[PDB]
Ligand binder design. Structure first.
Ligand code: P4H
Ligand code: P4H
Ligand code: CA
Ligand code: CA
Lengths: 121, 121
């Protein structure tokens, strides 16, 4: 399993130790408070009132937790995933990323605490 | 495992399929948007700005997801719990409840989608 912190101001995101392999089933739990700029903070589903002005993930709100698996597009994580299976031909290291507009991460604050495990399969 | 909706206006909470037994390891993932009254909605960690005016759980924010295990007091769930073990004084059915002030649930809206499963032990 993997446990770590994902900083809101980290544009590259955090590469985890989890390699998603064909047939894997995974569980993610995310917690904590972060901001894309305002003094207010939001949880891992982000801010449902903020418009999308070029977010790295168009399927999640600004300030949501998202991920990439290998060279995949962004995949929403939000509060987490329960016994979840990846699309076919999605594989590789899981990177966790805060959902914001590229080049606008500098003013972000806080972080999410994230657990990832492989489930029985 | 169990999956279901926990309504914010359900003062009694939702009894799940899960009987927490001594030594059980469980994972909970909670998602969605709910309100304790305002038109604004919050995730399963609730509203980090709202004072505690007599919440059923003093250890979580107003509008957070909490639970009881059998005849236990409230235990914070928030976004969820990863491979979590209860203290050995707690057993029985898990009831999921929205964190609000007793008698003030009538005006609540929205719900959380929750998954609970037992892990290897
Ligand atoms: O595969 C999914 C996916 C994401 C979250 C879920 O809760 C789920 O059941 C499936 C997916 C969703 C959005 C997206 O842009 C890409 C994805 O692969
Ligand atoms: O474990 C508890 C807990 C709460 C009520 C009980 O009757 C009990 O036997 C145990 C707990 C309480 C507060 C908290 O913030 C986290 C907890 O796990
Ligand atoms: Ca920003
Ligand atoms: Ca209320």
């Amino acid at each position: 399993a993997w446990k770590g912190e994902v900083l809101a101001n980290n544009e590259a995101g955090q590469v985890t130790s989890i390699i998603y392999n064909p047939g894997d089933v995974i569980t993610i739990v995310a917690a904590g408070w972060a901001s894309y700029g305002p003094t207010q903070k939001w949880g891992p589903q982000g801010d449902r009132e903020h418009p999308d002005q070029g977010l790295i993930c168009h399927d999640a709100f600004c300030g949501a937790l998202v991920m990439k698996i290998g060279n995949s597009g962004t995949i929403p994580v939000n509060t987490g995933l329960f016994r979840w299976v990846a699309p076919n031909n999605v594989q590789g290291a899981i990177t966790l990323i805060y959902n914001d507009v590229p080049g606008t991460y500098g003013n972000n604050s806080g972080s999410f605490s994230v657990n990832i495990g492989k489930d029985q399969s």
